[PDB]
Amino acid sequence: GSGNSQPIWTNPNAAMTMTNNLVQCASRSGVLTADQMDDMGMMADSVNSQMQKMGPNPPQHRLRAMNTAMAAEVAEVVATSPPQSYSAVLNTIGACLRESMMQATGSVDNAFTNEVMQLVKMLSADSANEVST
Amino acid sequence: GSGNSQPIWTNPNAAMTMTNNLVQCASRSGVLTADQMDDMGMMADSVNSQMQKMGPNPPQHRLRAMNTAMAAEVAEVVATSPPQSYSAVLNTIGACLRESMMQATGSVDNAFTNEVMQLVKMLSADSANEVST
Incomplete structure (x- = not known):
């Protein structure tokens, strides 16, 4: 939490490196299933195939x-x-997110890594009301 | 909220219909900027072209x-x-979420409509520390 977290989402190739490294990290952990590995697989593929649809310089808002x-x-x-x-x-x-960032850019971004944590908890939280009493 | 809700993503084209209706509803409202509108537009395109890549009946887990x-x-x-x-x-x-579903499947998918609401509130909430006393 030192200062501001710098999202590497500006260079699509650099960002895609994290996406690729995630699948590689998941593949060498084996904690995930065919579901997960293939969904993450098409994750790296979608980023790639959407870029090839746009060109060597797409609109930054799409990368957003x-x-x-x-x-x-x-x-x-x-x-x-x-x-x-x-x-x-x-x-x-x-952990893979952290490593992938360091292998992609050289530094660990917490903004993206944190976002995914909040996402996954939320997807696993079936509660429309604060069930804390 | 009323009981449970069966995800209408049992048909990828039915779901894609919502994606299209959302863009139309957003375009006809004009509340969103060109950035956000075009990103939603390419959202329809991404699903559209991803579907083609996976065939008329893609992997069920991928639809998930x-x-x-x-x-x-x-x-x-x-x-x-x-x-x-x-x-x-x-x-x-x-608002458009509900209408889109009703005009796509004929019923209001609570799972997706609720998911978006939770996503958007969290997506703009960057605070991992207690702001409350």
């Missing part, structure tokens, strides 16, 4: 929307796991 | 993921609105 797309996909992925596996996959991905 | 992807894109654009327009766009999308 890709930020939450990639993040939400991973969260949906993790939240699909059984209760016992959920914590394990979450822990794994939560 | 795509559910949250579409919702996240709408939530992001709403959460990227000005501080005074955020409430305006939010209300607009929430």
Whole structure:
């Protein structure tokens, strides 16, 4: 929480590197299932295939929307796991995000990493009311 | 809210119909900026072209993921609105959500409509510390 977290979402290739590294990290952890690995697989694919539809220089606002797309996909992925596996996959991905950032840009962004954490918890929180009394 | 709600993503084209209706409803309201409108537009395109890549009947688990992807894109654009327009766009999308579903499947999908509302509120809430006493 030192200062401001700098989202690497400005260079699409650099950001895509994190997406690729996530799948590789998941593939070498084995905590995830065919569901998760294939959804994350098409996650990296979608980013790639949408870019090739646009060109070597797409509109930055689209990359903006890709930020939450990639993040939400991973969260949906993790939240699909059984209760016992959920914590394990979450822990794994939560670490994979950190590493992927360091391998992509060289520094760890917390903005994206944090967003995914809040996403995955929310997808796993079936509560429309504060059930705390 | 009334009982449970069966996700209308049992048919990808039926769901895609909502994606199209959302853009139309947003375009006809004009509450959203060109940025947010075009991102929602490419949201329809991304699902559209992704579907083609996966065939007339893509993997069921991928449709599961795509559910949250579409919702996240709408939530992001709403959460990227000005501080005074955020409430305006939010209300607009929430209204269009219901109508879109009713004109797409014939019923109001609570799961997706609720997901977007939770997403957008969280998406614009960057505060991981207790702001309350």
